Design a protein around this ligand. Structure first.
Ligand SMILES: CSCC[C@H](NC=O)C(=O)O
Ligand SMILES: [Mg+2]
Ligand SMILES: [Mg+2]
Ligand SMILES: [Mg+2]
Ligand SMILES: [Mg+2]
Ligand SMILES: [Mg+2]
Ligand SMILES: [Mg+2]
Ligand SMILES: [Mg+2]
Ligand SMILES: [Mg+2]
Ligand SMILES: [Mg+2]
Ligand SMILES: [Mg+2]
Ligand SMILES: [Mg+2]
Ligand SMILES: [Mg+2]
Ligand SMILES: [Mg+2]
Ligand SMILES: [Mg+2]
Ligand SMILES: [Mg+2]
Ligand SMILES: [Mg+2]
Ligand SMILES: [Mg+2]
Ligand SMILES: [Mg+2]
Ligand SMILES: [Mg+2]
Ligand SMILES: [Mg+2]
Ligand SMILES: [Mg+2]
Ligand SMILES: [Mg+2]
Ligand SMILES: [Mg+2]
Ligand SMILES: [Mg+2]
Ligand SMILES: [Mg+2]
Ligand SMILES: [Mg+2]
Ligand SMILES: [Mg+2]
Ligand SMILES: [Mg+2]
Ligand SMILES: [Mg+2]
Ligand SMILES: [Mg+2]
Ligand SMILES: [Mg+2]
Ligand SMILES: [Mg+2]
Ligand SMILES: [Mg+2]
Ligand SMILES: [Mg+2]
Ligand SMILES: [Mg+2]
Ligand SMILES: [Mg+2]
Ligand SMILES: [Mg+2]
Ligand SMILES: [Mg+2]
Ligand SMILES: [Mg+2]
Ligand SMILES: [Mg+2]
Ligand SMILES: [Mg+2]
Ligand SMILES: [Mg+2]
Ligand SMILES: [Mg+2]
Ligand SMILES: [Mg+2]
Ligand SMILES: [Mg+2]
Ligand SMILES: [Mg+2]
Ligand SMILES: [Mg+2]
Ligand SMILES: [Mg+2]
Ligand SMILES: [Mg+2]
Ligand SMILES: [Mg+2]
Ligand SMILES: [Mg+2]
Ligand SMILES: [Mg+2]
Ligand SMILES: [Mg+2]
Ligand SMILES: [Mg+2]
Ligand SMILES: [Mg+2]
Ligand SMILES: [Mg+2]
Ligand SMILES: [Mg+2]
Ligand SMILES: [Mg+2]
Ligand SMILES: [Mg+2]
Ligand SMILES: [Mg+2]
Ligand SMILES: [Mg+2]
Ligand SMILES: [Mg+2]
Ligand SMILES: [Mg+2]
Ligand SMILES: [Mg+2]
Ligand SMILES: [Mg+2]
Ligand SMILES: [Mg+2]
Ligand SMILES: [Mg+2]
Ligand SMILES: [Mg+2]
Ligand SMILES: [Mg+2]
Ligand SMILES: [Mg+2]
Ligand SMILES: [Mg+2]
Ligand SMILES: [Mg+2]
Ligand SMILES: [Mg+2]
Ligand SMILES: [Mg+2]
Ligand SMILES: [Mg+2]
Ligand SMILES: [Mg+2]
Ligand SMILES: [Mg+2]
Ligand SMILES: [Mg+2]
Ligand SMILES: [Mg+2]
Ligand SMILES: [Mg+2]
Ligand SMILES: [Mg+2]
Ligand SMILES: [Mg+2]
Ligand SMILES: [Mg+2]
Ligand SMILES: [Mg+2]
Ligand SMILES: [Mg+2]
Ligand SMILES: [Mg+2]
Ligand SMILES: [Mg+2]
Ligand SMILES: [Mg+2]
Ligand SMILES: [Mg+2]
Ligand SMILES: [Mg+2]
Ligand SMILES: [Mg+2]
Ligand SMILES: [Mg+2]
Ligand SMILES: [Mg+2]
Ligand SMILES: [Mg+2]
Ligand SMILES: [Mg+2]
Ligand SMILES: [Mg+2]
Ligand SMILES: [Mg+2]
Ligand SMILES: [Mg+2]
Ligand SMILES: [Mg+2]
Ligand SMILES: [Mg+2]
Ligand SMILES: [Mg+2]
Ligand SMILES: [Mg+2]
Ligand SMILES: [Mg+2]
Ligand SMILES: [Mg+2]
Ligand SMILES: [Mg+2]
Ligand SMILES: [Mg+2]
Ligand SMILES: [Mg+2]
Ligand SMILES: [Mg+2]
Ligand SMILES: [Mg+2]
Ligand SMILES: [Mg+2]
Ligand SMILES: [Mg+2]
Ligand SMILES: [Mg+2]
Ligand SMILES: [Mg+2]
Ligand SMILES: [Mg+2]
Ligand SMILES: [Mg+2]
Ligand SMILES: [Mg+2]
Ligand SMILES: [Mg+2]
Ligand SMILES: [Mg+2]
Ligand SMILES: [Mg+2]
Ligand SMILES: [Mg+2]
Ligand SMILES: [Mg+2]
Ligand SMILES: [Mg+2]
Ligand SMILES: [Mg+2]
Ligand SMILES: [Mg+2]
Ligand SMILES: [Mg+2]
Ligand SMILES: [Mg+2]
Ligand SMILES: [Mg+2]
Ligand SMILES: [Mg+2]
Ligand SMILES: [Mg+2]
Ligand SMILES: [Mg+2]
Ligand SMILES: [Mg+2]
Ligand SMILES: [Mg+2]
Ligand SMILES: [Mg+2]
Ligand SMILES: [Mg+2]
Ligand SMILES: [Mg+2]
Ligand SMILES: [Mg+2]
Ligand SMILES: [Mg+2]
Ligand SMILES: [Mg+2]
Ligand SMILES: [Mg+2]
Ligand SMILES: [Mg+2]
Ligand SMILES: [Mg+2]
Ligand SMILES: [Mg+2]
Ligand SMILES: [Mg+2]
Ligand SMILES: [Mg+2]
Ligand SMILES: [Mg+2]
Ligand SMILES: [Mg+2]
Ligand SMILES: [Mg+2]
Ligand SMILES: [Mg+2]
Ligand SMILES: [Mg+2]
Ligand SMILES: [Mg+2]
Ligand SMILES: [Mg+2]
Ligand SMILES: [Mg+2]
Ligand SMILES: [Mg+2]
Ligand SMILES: [Mg+2]
Ligand SMILES: [Mg+2]
Ligand SMILES: [Mg+2]
Ligand SMILES: [Mg+2]
Ligand SMILES: [Mg+2]
Ligand SMILES: [Mg+2]
Ligand SMILES: [Mg+2]
Ligand SMILES: [Mg+2]
Ligand SMILES: [Mg+2]
Ligand SMILES: [Mg+2]
Ligand SMILES: [Mg+2]
Ligand SMILES: [Mg+2]
Ligand SMILES: [Mg+2]
Ligand SMILES: [Mg+2]
Ligand SMILES: [Mg+2]
Ligand SMILES: [Mg+2]
Ligand SMILES: [Mg+2]
Ligand SMILES: [Mg+2]
Ligand SMILES: [Mg+2]
Ligand SMILES: [Mg+2]
Ligand SMILES: [Mg+2]
Ligand SMILES: [Mg+2]
Ligand SMILES: [Mg+2]
Ligand SMILES: [Mg+2]
Ligand SMILES: [Mg+2]
Ligand SMILES: [Mg+2]
Ligand SMILES: [Mg+2]
Ligand SMILES: [Mg+2]
Ligand SMILES: [Mg+2]
Ligand SMILES: [Mg+2]
Ligand SMILES: [Mg+2]
Ligand SMILES: [Mg+2]
Ligand SMILES: [Mg+2]
Ligand SMILES: [Mg+2]
Ligand SMILES: [Mg+2]
Ligand SMILES: [Mg+2]
Ligand SMILES: [Mg+2]
Ligand SMILES: [Mg+2]
Ligand SMILES: [Mg+2]
Ligand SMILES: [Mg+2]
Ligand SMILES: [Mg+2]
Ligand SMILES: [Mg+2]
Ligand SMILES: [Mg+2]
Ligand SMILES: [Mg+2]
Ligand SMILES: [Mg+2]
Ligand SMILES: [Mg+2]
Ligand SMILES: [Mg+2]
Ligand SMILES: [Mg+2]
Ligand SMILES: [Mg+2]
Ligand SMILES: [Mg+2]
Ligand SMILES: [Mg+2]
Ligand SMILES: [Mg+2]
Ligand SMILES: [Mg+2]
Ligand SMILES: [Mg+2]
Ligand SMILES: [Mg+2]
Ligand SMILES: [Mg+2]
Ligand SMILES: [Mg+2]
Ligand SMILES: [Mg+2]
Ligand SMILES: [Mg+2]
Ligand SMILES: [Mg+2]
Ligand SMILES: [Mg+2]
Ligand SMILES: [Mg+2]
Ligand SMILES: [Mg+2]
Ligand SMILES: [Mg+2]
Ligand SMILES: [Mg+2]
Ligand SMILES: [Mg+2]
Ligand SMILES: [Mg+2]
Ligand SMILES: [Mg+2]
Ligand SMILES: [Mg+2]
Ligand SMILES: [Mg+2]
Ligand SMILES: [Mg+2]
Ligand SMILES: [Mg+2]
Ligand SMILES: [Mg+2]
Ligand SMILES: [Mg+2]
Ligand SMILES: [Mg+2]
Ligand SMILES: [Mg+2]
Ligand SMILES: [Mg+2]
Ligand SMILES: [Mg+2]
Ligand SMILES: [Mg+2]
Ligand SMILES: [Mg+2]
Ligand SMILES: [Mg+2]
Ligand SMILES: [Mg+2]
Ligand SMILES: [Mg+2]
Ligand SMILES: [Mg+2]
Lengths: 55, 122, 114, 208, 119
RNA sequence: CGAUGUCGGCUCAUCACAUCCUGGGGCUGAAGUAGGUCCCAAGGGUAUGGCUGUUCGCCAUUUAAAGUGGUACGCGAGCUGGGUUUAGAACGUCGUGAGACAGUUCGGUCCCUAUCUGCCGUGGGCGCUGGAGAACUGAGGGGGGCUGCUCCUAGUACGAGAGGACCGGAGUGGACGCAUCACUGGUGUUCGGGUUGUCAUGCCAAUGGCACUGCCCGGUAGCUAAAUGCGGAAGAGAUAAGUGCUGAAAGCAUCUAAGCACGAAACUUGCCCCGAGAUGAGUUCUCCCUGACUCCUUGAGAGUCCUGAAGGAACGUUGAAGACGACGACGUUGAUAGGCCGGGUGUGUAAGCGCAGCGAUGCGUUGAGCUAACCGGUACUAAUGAACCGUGAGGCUUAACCU
RNA sequence: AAUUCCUUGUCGGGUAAGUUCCGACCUGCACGAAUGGCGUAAUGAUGGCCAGGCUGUCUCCACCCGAGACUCAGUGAAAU
RNA sequence: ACACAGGUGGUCAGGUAGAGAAUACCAAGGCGCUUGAGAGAACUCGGGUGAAGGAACUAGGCAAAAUGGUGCCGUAACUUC
RNA sequence: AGGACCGAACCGACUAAUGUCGAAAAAUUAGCGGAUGACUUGUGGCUGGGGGUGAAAGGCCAAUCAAACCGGGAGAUAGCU
């Protein structure tokens, strides 16, 4: 337990280098409607692979 | 699977009714005996007319065990009681004239050919 | 797999008589006195049966002289010569381990006879 | 030399005298040679083999070309074996299980089963501390890991909790039982590393 | 280490986990479509699809089993009468998963589960 | 002294050699067996119990041995708190008394989520000079090194007898390690059954809920040890202690000063693992990119239209892989998972009805029904067309050199 | 001996083995008669020792069931 | 000090089993405890089961395990009867 | 009849584990003692700091006790840091 003496801005930074989260960069396009969504996920309106799923 | 503090019923008629293993012989840090291994015994209960009195330290051979004896074929022979035959420390050989109950084939290691002849089964 | 199942099916002796648990079985067993080759008997009540094809087995309990003996036989072993059935028990359990705790009159079982 | 082969469980062979010898069933298909490495090019003499069969898509171009060089079909994975001076093989040659017909004992190498992050009790056979008799939050822990001021440090190669298994290991001098030429099997006495389906690099016993 | 094992614990005890599938399987058959967490949807398949097979052979013992499971005579009535003969030609795969993003209050990966018909 | 937790035990160790065992030797008041001492040797091994807080010690029984020490009399941010040092009380003793006494006796809170170093695991980044995917090489590092007893040589050598070998060889043990789950078993709150109380589905019957899985009996896969395989090696190099050969200095002599040999579990290899971040960044193999333009301080400059490859990542189904990353299998040109079908297994004769009975119940249909992770199949459901990052023939200086 | 220093006194019992325990011996360092002496049934979350039963306390750990630990989203400390 | 698993006096006392206001399951009536979702490592916590042995553990059977109800039969030394 | 027996309420606090920047400035969980009396408890009184009260531990007297707490002498004094 307990730090003997405080770490720096640098160390604190060096630890956080990996905390940066990645983007999706992989948006789909629905065949019929042409709406953007995640791969293997349904659309906002309710489509999946050019067919109506949920009203 | 016999070890220090294991109590044993006695197969032969030397005198002892119940005995206790005080040591397993034949190596350092040796955990268990069984099958037909030598152990050191103390007599915790003896009959009045027997050859050996109570609280006497002597050697013995484990003839029956509850955990049992494995064969070469994959079969196993178990029993319903851990049992041993008493021996004469330096002389070896069984003290009792007769042996009650069965005894396994893996006991057939010469020196014990006296023990197998007296036993009724196996 | 098929590769294993092919290796198991060739070894299995194809003439094992059917017996249930609670049957008074008399197993014949090959024993060897150095040079000799004898057939020992081992009559007793069947307590448990393990079916795994080639890896099958069964427990025979025999209350011999003095104390009880319990012998697990590997059904497809060449040491097991033959497995004759004397009686068939009217028990309604696969494993009869409660018979270890019983002796004499309590240990005896009803006859099937159907 | 040695052969590659998939582990296919275990069985037991009943010998006529009585003994039920426990055997591992190793399928050893036609191990076909992709490259013959030698002292002119490589600085050592060896053969690279393959076995099984990838689907016509999962193999990439760099790997698929490597197979066209020899002319063999794209077998799944690739392995190498060092030649023992005298023996010499050709590219596109199909080695069979018959190489183990003459030998008695074999070293089987494989990938041991993955136990994961194992503790010191499991991994290094550490003794658990007293389960009661006062004990507080330290039953299965390692206990001490060093001295004091003197090293002022834990020594390297200290036995600690970590990744157990999923490592290449060799069980040496396993006695061969049967060499099924027709079914392409190699029955060996005992148990070999890895689970059913894992790849086994079998070879003759170095400890002769 | 859980090698070769099956069944998701889902941060619950056994009797609870068996109940929440008994409720959710009942709910799926009634409404014919459900929004739930992607693993709950996945593990609902293991429970529901065996009820649809049991529902094909309409008799008594099967009704009593299908009532021993579910524990709702309505769901046992919607099985056998409707969903039994409707999934007669189809050999397995009576249910279908469709991922629908994430839950607002906790970011759980949601997923619609429904019967392969809705007509 | 604005605190460096003091004995003993447990867990975990690690080094020294002044070696307890195992290995190699000299002398011996060494016939052999067994010693005695001394020399080299630190590779590996080195009790379990009774008593006491004990360390130690004595005692019982093992063992080849039960080594001596260092490591804050190793190790309390790892555990214990029996002892010693708080407050209570008592005994003896000392004190007129308050109280006091390595004199004794009974009872008496052991805190800390780890920043850094270190250590065991496991990844992301960039590098290794076109990119990519594979297969190696090995610098270097780590692992492993225990040993009994039985028989054979041989009742041989040796010895008056009794006793009893070296040197070799074989077998089977213990301990320890590695692997595995074929067997024997354990486990198995996801499989089957019995059954107590009570509540429920209208009720009977049949189910289910709750009672620690309500209590039990069995048990599939998995994981597993007490279960079953395997291991320490022979081999070589250089030696330690020692034994020698030839041979001076020193007509001889003497193992050495030239020259030449032997010689141990030590040392270097051999056996297993990791391992080119080995920046000294090695090799082999295959794969992929062969288009334009302007711009100025003409530079490995900076640009612009186009092209986007090999391949990777991402996403999905997932795994005998896994904390998370990662690692492996599969994505419709498909058995990756779920289902479904058929087994196998398990439990042990379901339900309904029928009959015998006053009733409980008994049969009968019936080895039935129900069967988790098993096995073999099967595209029925879900794994989507695409996007995405990754480019455009890869410096300079020489040398060997092909036209 | 809650008192004994020399001390693990000496002998006996129990145990394979007992610095503890129980019985006795007096050599009471330094017991002793209402700061009570010696007995003593009953009683005790009392101190010491032995036996049976029972047990994962242990030989020697194994698996299983939940709650955290671990990952994702939200909120978000502390000693130093 | 808190929407803090603490403390706080009196009254009302349904069913089944039970000696019972114990306990189990329920009724009336009330609640699911103001972070969830995954995964199913070590390790900790609370539990379950355990082959053979059975106090060998340890300062000490600490902790667990075990015994357990009602009726009847029977029940020793010692005793202040 | 009983400072009788077993055992809930109630009162206690022997053991263990958990907790030890806790859920809690003394608690939780499983066992544990008393439970018709020297019992326990509600409401209101009385006793005051060298004073009280104390089946006596130097215990308790508002989370404070070998002499409370608050204000004052008061910036006590300090050969000490
Ligand atoms: C309160 S008395 C403390 C006694 C002391 N303990 C630690 O140092 C000794 O030394
Ligand atoms: Mg500082
Ligand atoms: Mg971070
Ligand atoms: Mg004696
Ligand atoms: Mg053995
Ligand atoms: Mg069993
Ligand atoms: Mg493609
Ligand atoms: Mg791929
Ligand atoms: Mg690969
Ligand atoms: Mg794995
Ligand atoms: Mg272990
Ligand atoms: Mg292991
Ligand atoms: Mg231990
Ligand atoms: Mg404690
Ligand atoms: Mg702690
Ligand atoms: Mg604890
Ligand atoms: Mg604590
Ligand atoms: Mg700790
Ligand atoms: Mg802690
Ligand atoms: Mg130093
Ligand atoms: Mg230093
Ligand atoms: Mg061998
Ligand atoms: Mg699976
Ligand atoms: Mg789980
Ligand atoms: Mg959670
Ligand atoms: Mg329940
Ligand atoms: Mg709807
Ligand atoms: Mg909805
Ligand atoms: Mg289910
Ligand atoms: Mg099913
Ligand atoms: Mg069917
Ligand atoms: Mg300081
Ligand atoms: Mg210590
Ligand atoms: Mg010790
Ligand atoms: Mg130790
Ligand atoms: Mg020396
Ligand atoms: Mg010396
Ligand atoms: Mg010599
Ligand atoms: Mg060493
Ligand atoms: Mg060395
Ligand atoms: Mg060496
Ligand atoms: Mg001990
Ligand atoms: Mg004792
Ligand atoms: Mg003491
Ligand atoms: Mg010491
Ligand atoms: Mg010492
Ligand atoms: Mg001393
Ligand atoms: Mg000593
Ligand atoms: Mg000792
Ligand atoms: Mg001795
Ligand atoms: Mg001795
Ligand atoms: Mg001896
Ligand atoms: Mg000896
Ligand atoms: Mg000696
Ligand atoms: Mg010192
Ligand atoms: Mg110390
Ligand atoms: Mg210490
Ligand atoms: Mg420390
Ligand atoms: Mg103490
Ligand atoms: Mg005092
Ligand atoms: Mg005076
Ligand atoms: Mg003192
Ligand atoms: Mg004192
Ligand atoms: Mg004392
Ligand atoms: Mg004390
Ligand atoms: Mg006390
Ligand atoms: Mg204490
Ligand atoms: Mg305490
Ligand atoms: Mg404590
Ligand atoms: Mg601590
Ligand atoms: Mg680090
Ligand atoms: Mg590491
Ligand atoms: Mg990386
Ligand atoms: Mg990467
Ligand atoms: Mg890069
Ligand atoms: Mg280059
Ligand atoms: Mg190049
Ligand atoms: Mg290149
Ligand atoms: Mg490259
Ligand atoms: Mg090297
Ligand atoms: Mg090395
Ligand atoms: Mg090493
Ligand atoms: Mg030896
Ligand atoms: Mg002879
Ligand atoms: Mg002679
Ligand atoms: Mg002889
Ligand atoms: Mg010699
Ligand atoms: Mg020798
Ligand atoms: Mg010798
Ligand atoms: Mg030899
Ligand atoms: Mg060790
Ligand atoms: Mg082992
Ligand atoms: Mg299996
Ligand atoms: Mg079910
Ligand atoms: Mg019933
Ligand atoms: Mg009702
Ligand atoms: Mg209902
Ligand atoms: Mg009713
Ligand atoms: Mg009914
Ligand atoms: Mg019926
Ligand atoms: Mg039930
Ligand atoms: Mg209910
Ligand atoms: Mg309830
Ligand atoms: Mg409860
Ligand atoms: Mg009971
Ligand atoms: Mg069982
Ligand atoms: Mg079983
Ligand atoms: Mg073996
Ligand atoms: Mg050598
Ligand atoms: Mg050499
Ligand atoms: Mg040499
Ligand atoms: Mg000369
Ligand atoms: Mg050796
Ligand atoms: Mg050597
Ligand atoms: Mg040797
Ligand atoms: Mg090599
Ligand atoms: Mg190598
Ligand atoms: Mg390797
Ligand atoms: Mg390693
Ligand atoms: Mg590795
Ligand atoms: Mg690397
Ligand atoms: Mg490189
Ligand atoms: Mg180079
Ligand atoms: Mg250009
Ligand atoms: Mg230019
Ligand atoms: Mg540019
Ligand atoms: Mg562009
Ligand atoms: Mg692009
Ligand atoms: Mg192109
Ligand atoms: Mg591609
Ligand atoms: Mg592409
Ligand atoms: Mg790339
Ligand atoms: Mg998945
Ligand atoms: Mg990721
Ligand atoms: Mg990846
Ligand atoms: Mg594909
Ligand atoms: Mg399949
Ligand atoms: Mg197909
Ligand atoms: Mg069928
Ligand atoms: Mg079956
Ligand atoms: Mg029947
Ligand atoms: Mg029937
Ligand atoms: Mg039923
Ligand atoms: Mg029926
Ligand atoms: Mg029935
Ligand atoms: Mg009839
Ligand atoms: Mg009738
Ligand atoms: Mg009548
Ligand atoms: Mg049948
Ligand atoms: Mg069946
Ligand atoms: Mg199924
Ligand atoms: Mg399948
Ligand atoms: Mg499809
Ligand atoms: Mg097809
Ligand atoms: Mg289709
Ligand atoms: Mg260019
Ligand atoms: Mg070119
Ligand atoms: Mg160029
Ligand atoms: Mg006295
Ligand atoms: Mg007194
Ligand atoms: Mg004394
Ligand atoms: Mg005696
Ligand atoms: Mg004595
Ligand atoms: Mg004791
Ligand atoms: Mg005395
Ligand atoms: Mg005097
Ligand atoms: Mg006095
Ligand atoms: Mg007087
Ligand atoms: Mg007086
Ligand atoms: Mg008095
Ligand atoms: Mg007195
Ligand atoms: Mg008294
Ligand atoms: Mg009292
Ligand atoms: Mg007591
Ligand atoms: Mg006592
Ligand atoms: Mg006694
Ligand atoms: Mg006794
Ligand atoms: Mg629970
Ligand atoms: Mg928690
Ligand atoms: Mg994900
Ligand atoms: Mg967070
Ligand atoms: Mg702060
Ligand atoms: Mg709240
Ligand atoms: Mg209270
Ligand atoms: Mg009031
Ligand atoms: Mg009223
Ligand atoms: Mg009634
Ligand atoms: Mg009531
Ligand atoms: Mg209640
Ligand atoms: Mg009711
Ligand atoms: Mg309500
Ligand atoms: Mg919560
Ligand atoms: Mg868990
Ligand atoms: Mg537990
Ligand atoms: Mg636990
Ligand atoms: Mg069970
Ligand atoms: Mg057990
Ligand atoms: Mg048992
Ligand atoms: Mg016992
Ligand atoms: Mg006892
Ligand atoms: Mg002891
Ligand atoms: Mg005892
Ligand atoms: Mg003691
Ligand atoms: Mg002790
Ligand atoms: Mg207790
Ligand atoms: Mg209990
Ligand atoms: Mg009773
Ligand atoms: Mg009774
Ligand atoms: Mg009754
Ligand atoms: Mg009486
Ligand atoms: Mg008596
Ligand atoms: Mg009298
Ligand atoms: Mg008495
Ligand atoms: Mg009186
Ligand atoms: Mg009264
Ligand atoms: Mg009373
Ligand atoms: Mg009382
Ligand atoms: Mg009471
Ligand atoms: Mg209550
Ligand atoms: Mg309390
Ligand atoms: Mg307290
Ligand atoms: Mg309590
Ligand atoms: Mg009570
Ligand atoms: Mg009481
Ligand atoms: Mg009072
Ligand atoms: Mg009062
Ligand atoms: Mg009060
Ligand atoms: Mg009061
Ligand atoms: Mg007043
Ligand atoms: Mg006043
Ligand atoms: Mg005043
Ligand atoms: Mg008071
Ligand atoms: Mg005082
Ligand atoms: Mg205050
Ligand atoms: Mg005080
Ligand atoms: Mg004052
Ligand atoms: Mg003044
Ligand atoms: Mg001042």
């Amino acid at each position: 337990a307990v730090q003997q003496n405080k770490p720096t801005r640098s160390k604190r930074g060096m630890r956080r280098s990996h905390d940066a989260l990645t983007a999706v960069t992989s948006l789909s396009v629905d065949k019929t409607s042409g709406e953007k969504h995640l791969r293997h996920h349904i659309t906002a309106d309710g489509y999946y692979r050019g067919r109506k799923v949920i009203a | 699977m016999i070890q220090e503090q294991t109590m044993l019923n006695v197969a032969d008629n030397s005198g002892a009714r119940r005995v206790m293993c005080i040591k397993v012989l034949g190596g350092s840090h040796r955990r268990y005996a069984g099958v037909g291994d030598i152990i050191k015994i103390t007599i915790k209960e003896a009959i009045p007319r027997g050859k050996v009195k109570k609280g006497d330290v002597l050697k013995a051979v484990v003839v029956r065990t509850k955990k049992g004896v494995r064969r070469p074929d994959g079969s196993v022979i178990r029993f319903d009681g851990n049992a041993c035959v008493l021996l004469n420390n330096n002389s070896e050989q069984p003290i009792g004239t007769r042996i009650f109950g069965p005894v396994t084939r893996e006991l057939r290691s010469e020196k014990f050919m006296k023990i197998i002849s007296l036993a009724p089964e196996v | 797999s098929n590769i294993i199942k092919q290796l198991e099916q060739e070894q299995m002796k194809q003439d094992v008589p059917s017996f249930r648990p609670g049957d008074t079985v008399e197993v014949k067993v090959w024993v060897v006195e150095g040079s000799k080759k004898r057939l020992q008997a081992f009559e007793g009540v069947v307590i448990a049966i393990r079916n795994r094809g080639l890896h099958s087995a069964f427990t025979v309990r025999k209350i011999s002289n003095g104390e009880g003996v319990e012998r697990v036989f590997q059904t497809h072993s060449p040491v097991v010569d033959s497995i004759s059935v004397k009686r068939r028990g009217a028990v309604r359990k696969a494993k009869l381990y409660y018979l270890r705790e019983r002796t004499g009159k309590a240990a005896r079982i009803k006859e099937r006879l159907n | 030399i040695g052969l590659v082969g998939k582990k296919v469980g275990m069985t037991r062979i009943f010998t006529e005298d009585g003994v039920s010898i426990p055997v591992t069933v190793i399928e050893v298909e036609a191990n076909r040679v992709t490259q013959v490495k030698d002292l002119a090019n490589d600085g050592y003499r060896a053969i690279q083999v393959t076995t099984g069969a990838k689907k016509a898509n999962r193999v990439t171009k760099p790997e698929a070309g490597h197979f066209a060089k020899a002319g063999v079909e794209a077998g799944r994975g690739l392995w190498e074996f060092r030649l023992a001076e005298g023996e010499e093989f050709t590219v596109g040659q199909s080695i069979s299980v018959e190489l183990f017909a003459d030998v008695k004992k074999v070293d089987v190498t494989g990938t041991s089963k993955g136990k994961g992050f194992a503790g010191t009790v499991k991994r290094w056979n550490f003794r658990t501390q007293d389960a009661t008799h006062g004990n507080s939050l330290s039953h299965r822990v390692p206990g001490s890991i060093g001295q004091n001021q003197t090293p002022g440090k834990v020594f390297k190669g200290k036995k600690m909790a970590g990744q157990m298994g999923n490592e290449r290991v060799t069980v040496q001098s396993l006695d061969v039982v049967r060499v099924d030429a027709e079914r392409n099997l190699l029955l060996v006495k005992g148990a070999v590393p890895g689970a059913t389906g894992s790849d086994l690099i079998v070879k003759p016993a170095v400890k002769a | 280490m859980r090698h070769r094992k099956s069944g998701r614990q889902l941060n619950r005890n056994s009797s609870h986990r068996q109940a929440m599938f008994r409720n959710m399987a009942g709910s799926l058959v009634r409404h014919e479509i459900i929004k739930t967490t992607l693993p709950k949807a996945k593990e609902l398949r293991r429970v529901v699809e065996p009820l649809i097979t049991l529902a094909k052979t309409d008799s008594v013992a099967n009704r009593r089993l299908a009532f021993a499971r579910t524990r709702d005579n309505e769901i046992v009535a919607k099985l056998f009468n409707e969903l039994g003969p409707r999934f007669a030609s189809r050999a397995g795969g009576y249910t279908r998963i469709l991922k629908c993003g994430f839950r607002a209050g906790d970011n759980a990966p949601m997923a619609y589960i429904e019967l392969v018909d809705r007509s």
